[PDB]
Design a protein around this nucleic acid. Sequence first.
RNA 1: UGCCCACCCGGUCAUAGUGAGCGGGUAACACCCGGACUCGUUUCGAACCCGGAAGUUAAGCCGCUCACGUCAGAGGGGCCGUGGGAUCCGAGAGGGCCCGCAGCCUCUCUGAGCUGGGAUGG
RNA 2: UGGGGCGGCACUCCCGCGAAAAGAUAACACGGGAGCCCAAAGGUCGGCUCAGGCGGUACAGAACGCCGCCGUAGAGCGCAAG
RNA 3: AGGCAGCUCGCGGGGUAGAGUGACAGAUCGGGGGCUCCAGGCGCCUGGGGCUUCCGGUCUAACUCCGAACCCACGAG
Lengths: 168, 164, 97, 193
Amino acid sequence: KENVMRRVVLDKVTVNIGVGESGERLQKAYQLVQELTGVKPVYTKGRKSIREFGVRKGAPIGVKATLRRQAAVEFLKKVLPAVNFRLKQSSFDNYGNVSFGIAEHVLIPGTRYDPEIGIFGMDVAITLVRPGYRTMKRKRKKASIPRRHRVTKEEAINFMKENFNVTI
Amino acid sequence: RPGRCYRKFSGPAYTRREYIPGIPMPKITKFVMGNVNGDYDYELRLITTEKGQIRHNALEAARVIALKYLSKKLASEQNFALVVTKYPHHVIRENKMMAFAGADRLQDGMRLSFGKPIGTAARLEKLGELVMYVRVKKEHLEAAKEALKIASSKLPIRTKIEIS
Amino acid sequence: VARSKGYRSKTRKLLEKKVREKGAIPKLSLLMHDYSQGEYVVVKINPSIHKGMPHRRYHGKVGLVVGKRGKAYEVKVNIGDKERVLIVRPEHLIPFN
Amino acid sequence: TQGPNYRIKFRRRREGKTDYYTRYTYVINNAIRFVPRLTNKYVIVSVSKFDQKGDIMIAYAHSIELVKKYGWKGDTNNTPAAYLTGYLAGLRAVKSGVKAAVSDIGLFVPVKGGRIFAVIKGAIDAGLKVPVGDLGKLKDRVNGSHISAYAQKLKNENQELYNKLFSSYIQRGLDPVLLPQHFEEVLNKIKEN
RNA sequence: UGCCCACCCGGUCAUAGUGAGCGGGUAACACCCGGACUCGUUUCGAACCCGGAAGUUAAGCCGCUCACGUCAGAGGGGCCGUGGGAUCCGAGAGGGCCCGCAGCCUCUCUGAGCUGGGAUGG
RNA sequence: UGGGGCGGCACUCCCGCGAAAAGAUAACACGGGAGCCCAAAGGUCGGCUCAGGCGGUACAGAACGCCGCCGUAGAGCGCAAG
RNA sequence: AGGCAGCUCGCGGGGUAGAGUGACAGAUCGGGGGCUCCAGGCGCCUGGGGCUUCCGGUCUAACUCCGAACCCACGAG
């Protein structure tokens, strides 16, 4: 069946912490997500300085983590029960993308505690893939795929209801 | 200053505002009168004859006189519409320094005699270019004829009319 | 008001290039061919290339290949009733005729 | 394309084939190109020279003749295959009449010990004179000792690494451990022709 | 045979583009398999690098259709110059006329990839 | 120096315009700059692609971050312009 | 023993006259559609404010997607 590789698969979940400042909070946030993800995160350099919201160019203003096959999929398993009902179809785009955050990351049913570091919220982004994006990302014969090969919103909902038994 | 002072062309155009500071505000502010998009039948226009530049000051006066004549005729929103075509893009400059500095032994004479912006003109470059026009119905061309013609009385240059 | 004798003075469109051929040097085919003595060439400055830019005073003319030095060539051109030599990199040279 | 302002990069650039800036330098310096391009199934080597109607390749060789004219048995897109064809290129190049040229790379990341450096060394060992930086391949990579060493772990994955090819099911007995030994015999085969 | 059909190496640098739809692949080309060693990801085998290679025409690639962009041909319309000369007209501005040349925009219709060097496929 | 003085520097060099599709070409013509700054703002190699806009995510906000789409330069390239 | 103040042919260079402004940079007049906010009147209507789209027009020494006549280089005649 040609549809077996027209299928939609989960890929590269985004684990991003938004703090918007630099110093004395990134370190704890860096290690806080470390045991949540099991991998070493990466700081985010600041974009163009705005002089308000305390943001400057080149200043580390966030923590990002990324998980891959057999790790991204299991990472979703432990965060879904916290926010299974939080899922809204309104957060799904036309390109098979959806992101979901939490006001406070205590909601996760993990082995977390409340140390002196404090408490934080969290932002999570979900990426859906139809096999073959490598051409858009490979070095040679760079090109773009048409909308037909793209992942649509409806099938994205299916791949969330399926394989994850999530609400909506 | 008399209208004969700037009838002909003295040099190139004068357009770039960013290069020419401090332009006095043109007299004309409204360029369209009457019920545009209204139904009209007679299609008479206005045509010039010889080249030259027209000061906005006269045009604004020409704008006013045309309106009153039509306004008293039927109405201002009635089955008529007046639109003036050109815009005072051109700018005139005059060596006014002979007025102030021309009586105190300052750098008088042709010394540093570049012009100074005091007025604007709607430039004419083509033989027989539109200046204004008016749209009416079949029953009021007779009032429209002199209506343009009376306006033409104040224009510096010889003008021509037509019927369409 | 005397004008400055800048080496690129009064060139507001002399070094302007038609938008259809912007970017880095496209015409590699012209460069690869090599000149020898006695050849006749036409100078056409590429504004993009900053190396070996001949002065504007001799643009769009007929040139003669009299020799070679380094990666560049030297060219003889008559302008008035004198003689002059223009040492230039080849990327502003096009064969005559 | 959105109007008269829009400019179009070249067909190759539109298709991402060649870096012109690199090509630019060769043109101005009249460098004779050595092109060890790679594809997912074979290896491509050429010796090019510029001309008006386009580039001219003095000599050319392909992986396909190794399994056809020299009886290559292993993979066609790995290090030993990469080295073998490069050695072939020089022998064609040597009898061609060329002596010196420059490697042309383009879109291959210059990794030490990679396939690209493995290719160029073979031409060097073939006798082709091409100056090269001394951080190229590693000797063990050419014979594929690592591959056979990797193959020697077949006791672990319940099977040999060389899952039989499109035709190696009942026709080609891939011998992953006995890899370097197969290298010399073809190398000996190609050395004299 | 063959030659074109793609490919690698190109020239031309949009008439060759972009976007959508459809068609073609058991070779070629990719997608795609997996990373112990090479190398490598200011995380990740994503990508790159290496080892590969089941599946597969859905991507891409390729061809075709339609759109727009774009080169031309013709038609319609828009707009209009300049050299050469006169005790030519006009006070001037300006204009005609004899001698030589034109082009410009905008709509309609009609075409719209060419080509050198080598290993697959027919 | 459109008498001289006062005025100003058109007195040193640079951008455009003047200036009329070779060059050169005046004005006390017009619109402007320089008497520096950079050990990195320099050389090379490597990697990424901007301004801007759209959709979704806690604090989150038009504009701090994050995930996708478009974006032929509309950013940026030290200092004026080209 | 060639030389070149002219012309012709061939072969090149050009952004000026002009023309265009949805091709940049600006200047500039109006209408239509939609979105948004405010004021008034009886959810609606009117007026005003901001945004978008479409349609139309008016200029550029320091605008040029184009572009002559024309002038110039060289070879041959």
